[PDB]
Design a protein around this ligand. Structure first.
Ligand SMILES: Nc1ncnc2c1ncn2[C@@H]1O[C@H](COP(=O)(O)OP(=O)(O)CP(=O)(O)O)[C@@H](O)[C@H]1O
Length: 252
């Protein structure tokens, strides 16, 4: 379909696992996009050549103002290139280092943008493992865009919920956990179950051992508490998140 020839490639936007993401421009149209290079090599030799074909396909056909568009793809000798919407304000990760914590307005805002993006994603039966802040890009007006592609129906642990590490059966509730983690991390500046070892983060996640710094408000504590429940069934539905004294008081 497309080829390396169709694009002027520019500066590096960052390094991924299996290659880098370049800034690029389609020549006939001068459309500005991102162009993700993944080497066939470290997909062959990591057992994922299968895995991405599925994520692409899932991604290939879903569309939402807060989900990163995949436009298309192609390949050459030993490289595969994906073709992405380009997010100019980078990752929420950098925004979080640059700022350390987020105020309640922006935090509630991002959680709204996410719930939406996710409830739409629920409406078509899709889900999310790698739902973490380095996988959250910011668009030209300042809005979230999920950029991790994420699965349908069957690693650092900070963002995994209990059900996925104790090896159990797991459903859309997984995303509810992620929002609690993401919410906590936006406000506090670090994930609720952070540790220095994989093996402690497990106990910490398994039991749901987290505490709040003094500066975190009764209303946030409540939402985060509702979201971070060991039993998945006990966690809310996304509409209850959206309509929540706190979210509602603080979003845009
Ligand atoms: N579409 C885009 N627009 C702007 N910047 C992007 C982008 N895609 C990627 N980047 C930048 O390049 C980095 C590497 O890409 P990406 O994060 O997708 O790699 P990756 O999936 O292999 C590892 P992970 O998903 O865990 O971060 C991103 O963290 C981001 O800084």
């Amino acid at each position: 379909q497309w080829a390396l020839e169709d694009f002027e490639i520019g500066r590096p936007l960052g390094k991924g696992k299996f290659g880098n993401v370049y800034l690029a421009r389609e020549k006939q149209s001068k459309f500005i996009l991102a162009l993700k290079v993944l080497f066939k090599a470290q997909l062959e030799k990591a057992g994922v050549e299968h895995q991405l074909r599925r994520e692409v396909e899932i991604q290939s056909h879903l569309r939402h103002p807060n989900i990163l568009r995949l436009y298309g793809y192609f390949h050459d000798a030993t490289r595969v290139y994906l073709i992405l919407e380009y997010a100019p304000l980078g990752t929420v990760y950098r925004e979080l280092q640059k700022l350390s914590k987020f105020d309640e307005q922006r935090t509630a805002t991002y959680i709204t943008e996410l719930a939406n993006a996710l409830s739409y994603c629920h409406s078509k039966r899709v889900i999310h493992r790698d739902i973490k802040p380095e996988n959250l890009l910011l668009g030209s007006a300042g809005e979230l865009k999920i950029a991790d592609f994420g699965w349908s129906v069957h690693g650092t642990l900070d963002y995994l919920p209990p059900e996925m590490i104790e090896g159990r059966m797991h459903d859309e509730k997984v995303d509810l956990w992620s929002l609690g983690v993401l919410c906590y991390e936006f406000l506090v500046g670090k994930p609720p179950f952070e540790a220095n070892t994989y093996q402690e983060t497990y106990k910490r996640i398994s039991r749901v051992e987290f505490t709040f710094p003094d500066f975190v408000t009764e209303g946030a504590r409540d939402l985060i508490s509702r979201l971070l429940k060991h039993n998945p069934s006990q966690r809310p539905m996304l509409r209850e998140v959206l309509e929540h004294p706190w979210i509602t008081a603080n979003s845009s």
